[PDB]
UniProtKB/Swiss-Prot annotation, chain E:
Family under the similarity heading: Belongs to the bacterial ribosomal protein bS16 family.
GO terms under biological process: translation
Designated gene of the protein: rpsP
Entry-linked SUPFAM superfamilies: Ribosomal protein S16
PROSITE patterns listed in its UniProt record: RIBOSOMAL_S16
Protein's organism: Escherichia coli O45:K1 (strain S88 / ExPEC)
GO cellular component: cytoplasm; small ribosomal subunit
Superkingdom in the source lineage: Bacteria
Protein name: Small ribosomal subunit protein bS16
Keywords, in A-Z order: Ribonucleoprotein, Ribosomal protein
InterPro entries xref list: Ribosomal_bS16, Ribosomal_bS16_CS, Ribosomal_bS16_dom_sf
HAMAP family from the UniProt entry: Ribosomal_bS16
Length: 205, 156, 80, 129, 82, 87
RNA sequence: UUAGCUAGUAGGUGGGGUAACGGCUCACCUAGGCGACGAUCCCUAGCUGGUCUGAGAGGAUGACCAGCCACACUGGAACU
RNA sequence: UACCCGCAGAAGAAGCACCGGCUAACUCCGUGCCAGCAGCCGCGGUAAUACGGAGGGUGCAAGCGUUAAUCGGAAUUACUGGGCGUAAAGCGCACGCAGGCGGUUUGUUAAGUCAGAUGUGAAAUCCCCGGGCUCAACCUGGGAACUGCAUCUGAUACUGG
């Protein structure tokens, strides 16, 4: 129930950055960033209205690695809630446990953040949480437990967090390798390449 | 800043003694993201050529539409040539809910959160003429305060 | 005070029994039109005293007969 | 023939707007005045002039704005073949409340937004927008 | 006749009981009489485990109700704790 | 469309039937092969469509298209049909 | 393209009967009773909370849980 | 049993469907109205993006497809929310009962109608706010709702009497 294929192949499909590797080696030095994979990947078609709504939703899933049914459950939850549904939807996406570990930069990629939660190396409010898709409540702490603090892939990811923009809604520590979920973020606190007014309409045919 | 969307690519024909003269026709709409929008139906002997005539029609002859913040102000229906089309404001953060040409014409109209439904003919020429007529006579609370000789709070 | 009803005296031929029809005036559950609907009842009169075509006032009572569980209380506008 | 004076009235209002007349007259009724004394108050007509002794005749003054009309819509909700009785919660909002709905309740004739503040429903006559 | 017994309403291996006024000839899915409270044997900490209207219960014992074994135990032990 | 006519007579919503009645609202039904043969189709297409006349469970005698290319079908053989018309 | 239906039927009086009222049963009177707001007859069917869809209106639906009902080889009958 | 530590290695653990348009995703080769394909329009009659194979790609996922079965889309029975000059559709007209419908004005009535209040509308379910299981599914607390019906007290504009 995971994607296991080539990561940058998905980047070549959507054409934009998906942050799927550590960014140490330059991304364009690993793939033609503006050719879709395979034979007929150079020629850009007159892409239709249906496709760009699909490609937008296929972007956001492949941003966070979320399969369709479980992603649809987020849509059902966000539609049940109040206000802007896409802002509610992104909050659910930011509510993911394996997201915040990448947002705290403890794992270099989200998949490198996910394996840690899979291999039980995390403590949330002092409690180990095996589920990567767990929804993070506000004002909680996410601490590396002391079995796998000594992994070299932890502290090298901390430097990659220094390379990235530091998020705002995360009171993150370094010496204890812990953090604190301050508050929920905004639409504005995330990127602008994700349209609110498309992923709603795709699931509202 | 006037964003532009083609609507229809189409191939009609005249018939002469020699045969059939195919001619490509195109429907477009322009709009600024504010309450200014204009459609255009062009026609030529060529697909990338008739669209420019369709745009040039639409760049002229605009219409001024009283929007609300990100939506309509009150639900209303729209008709042109058997193409009865109902539309409706919605809550914030729900997107445009419409199909066909109506998705395009409201997006260049700069609304963001609507409810809409087409009845009868879904012919994209007359279905967008019905959208415009409903958006045209949709009027402000401020105008009907001035029309009725009152204020906003004398209406609420 | 008592749960009483009125209606139209339809039949008075059989002894110690009158047939009374009652208008219930009810909405249609779909179309919303208010319909005159008729509920007839076999009412035990005494004395066979009721004139035919009359407004009576009735009361639910203990079961008088096989088809009759209704007894009048009084009569308004007995004439034709 | 004559199945309603009210539907006669609203259509005579409706056809007078497009005819660009300044004065629409008709025989008057007690219920007709009770409606005509709302739309002046609500600002959809300018004047009504009830006159007539043997038979009262209501004469109206149509309100025109910027050349064109004011009455953008005028309807009938409770028709004589099908009556409408809605409670205080099911009172409508004509043109999202920008227009008005004439309701007759036990407290005479008023508008719906007054009837909501009166907190009591009744018979919805017509829609005026 | 009138009973007050424990009614299994929960998942497998994790029981939860609606201790209600019921009938001693009816069942657990089926007919109770009146819902007078609940009980969790997996009542953890920081949560109540037995919230019963202990006065309408006295109304029905006044009508001659029948009290079960744990129900007689737990109504005592509530009053032996509250 | 007058509501008095609507009172005296309700709107008769039209009742639709199945085009595949022999299954009798089942997903698949067992059948027995009766005759296996070919059939020329109608005008726009020209082929020999392999097809079998089938005795069913409920005694119905129907025809059902053999999909694919090539088969090992005999008469007096137990088969299973899913539906779908051939145009 | 089911229009007439009903003789204990319908009502009364009296007797009997049942825990209970009542053609419940019987006797004797009366001729009533029902139906075009569908009686009658035919076809199909356990019913509801609900379930599924639908923006709603509605539509379909009654496994699982409930509430009721009916049945227990078939047809019968009482017994306790 | 729940849960807790050791152990060992990337180890033992991914597949269906699809690419003519409808609808996201194409080339090559076989094939020649044959073999076939097919929800619809429709493809194959030697150069097939529609057949078959390959490559590549799209969609999903421990499942993926097909069939069955119900609503939606379908306003395609149109209460909400249709039409009848010629696209289906106003009886050949007239009469008229039941039927439905009703000018104006005053009282009366309060039936309808509206308002209020009691009773009931079981639980479950759904909704809302919570809680609990590492989360989720699930369980569960409280609430709202159960659109009704009955009764009582009004109300009097309209519709009735
Ligand atoms: Mg929202």
């Amino acid at each position: 129930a995971r994607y296991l294929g080539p990561k940058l192949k998905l980047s070549r499909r959507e054409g934009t950055d998906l942050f799927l590797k550590s960014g140490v080696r330059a991304i364009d030095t690993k793939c033609k960033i503006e050719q879709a994979p395979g034979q007929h990947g150079a020629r850009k078609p007159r892409l239709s209205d249906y496709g760009v709504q699909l490609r937008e939703k296929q972007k956001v899933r492949r941003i966070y690695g979320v399969l369709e049914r479980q992603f649809r459950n987020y849509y059902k939850e966000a539609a049940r809630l109040k206000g802007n549904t896409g802002e509610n939807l992104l909050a659910l996406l930011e509510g993911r446990l394996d997201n915040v570990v990448y947002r705290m930069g403890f794992g270099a990629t989200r998949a490198e953040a996910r394996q840690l939660v899979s291999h039980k190396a995390i403590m949330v409010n002092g409690r180990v949480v095996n589920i990567a898709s767990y929804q993070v409540s506000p004002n909680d702490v996410v601490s590396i437990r002391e079995k796998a603090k000594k992994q070299s892939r932890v502290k090298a990811a901390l430097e990659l967090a220094e390379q990235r923009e530091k998020p705002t809604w995360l009171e993150v520590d370094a010496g204890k390798m812990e953090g604190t979920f301050k508050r929920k973020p905004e639409r504005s606190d995330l990127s602008a390449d994700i349209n609110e007014h498309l992923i709603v309409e795709l699931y509202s045919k | 800043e006037l964003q532009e969307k083609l609507i229809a690519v189409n191939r009609v024909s005249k018939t002469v003694k020699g045969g059939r003269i195919f001619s490509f026709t195109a429907l477009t709409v322009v709009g600024d993201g504010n309450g200014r929008v204009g459609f255009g139906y062009g026609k030529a002997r060529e697909v990338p050529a008739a669209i420019q005539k369709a745009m040039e029609k639409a760049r002229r002859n605009m219409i001024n539409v009283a929007l609300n913040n990100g939506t309509l102000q009150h639900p209303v229906k729209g008709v042109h040539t058997g193409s009865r089309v109902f539309m409706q404001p919605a809550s914030e953060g729900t997107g445009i809910i419409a199909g066909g040409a109506m998705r395009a014409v409201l997006e260049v109209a700069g609304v963001h959160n609507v409810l809409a439904k087409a009845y009868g003919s879904t012919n994209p020429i007359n279905v967008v003429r019905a959208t415009i007529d409903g958006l045209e006579n949709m009027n402000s609370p401020e105008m009907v305060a001035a029309k009725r000789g009152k204020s906003v709070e004398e209406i609420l | 005070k008592i749960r009483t009803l009125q209606g139209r005296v339809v039949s008075d031929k059989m002894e110690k029994s009158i047939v009374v029809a009652i208008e219930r005036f009810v909405k249609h559950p779909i179309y919303g039109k208010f319909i005159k609907r008729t509920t007839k009842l076999h009412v035990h009169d005494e004395n066979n005293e009721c004139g035919i075509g009359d407004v009576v006032e009735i009361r639910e009572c203990r079961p008088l007969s096989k088809t009759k569980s209704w007894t009048l209380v009084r009569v308004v506008e007995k004439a034709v | 023939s004559m199945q309603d004076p009210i539907a006669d009235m609203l259509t005579r209002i409706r056809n007078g707007q497009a005819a660009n007349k300044a004065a629409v007259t008709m025989p008057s009724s007690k219920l007709k005045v009770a409606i005509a004394n709302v739309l002046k108050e609500e600002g959809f007509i300018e004047d009504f002039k009830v006159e007539g002794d043997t038979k009262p005749e209501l004469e109206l003054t149509l309100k025109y704005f910027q050349g064109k009309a004011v009455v953008e819509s005028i309807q009938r909700v409770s028709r004589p073949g099908l009556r409408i009785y809605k409670r205080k919660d099911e009172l409508p909002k004509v043109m999202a409340g920008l227009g008005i709905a004439v309701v007759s309740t036990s407290k005479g004739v008023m508008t719906d937004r007054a009837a909501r503040q009166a907190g009591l429903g009744g018979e919805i006559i017509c829609y005026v927008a | 006749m009138v009973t007050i017994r424990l009614a299994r309403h929960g998942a497998k291996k994790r029981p939860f009981y609606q201790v209600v006024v019921a009938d001693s000839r009816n069942a657990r899915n089926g007919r109770f009489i009146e819902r007078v409270g609940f009980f969790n044997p997996i009542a953890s900490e920081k949560e109540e485990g037995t919230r019963l209207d202990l006065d309408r219960i006295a109304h029905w014992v006044g009508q001659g109700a029948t009290i079960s074994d744990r129900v007689a135990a737990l109504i005592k032990e509530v009053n032996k704790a509250a | 469309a007058t509501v008095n006519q609507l009172v005296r007579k309700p709107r008769a919503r039209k009742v639709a039937k199945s085009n595949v009645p022999a299954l009798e609202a089942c997903p698949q039904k067992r059948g027995v092969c009766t005759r296996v043969y070919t059939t020329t189709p109608k005008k726009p297409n020209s082929a020999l469509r392999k097809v079998c006349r089938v005795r069913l469970t409920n005694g119905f005698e129907v025809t059902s298209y053999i999909g694919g290319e090539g088969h090992n079908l005999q008469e007096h053989s137990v088969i299973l049909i899913r539906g779908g018309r051939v145009k």
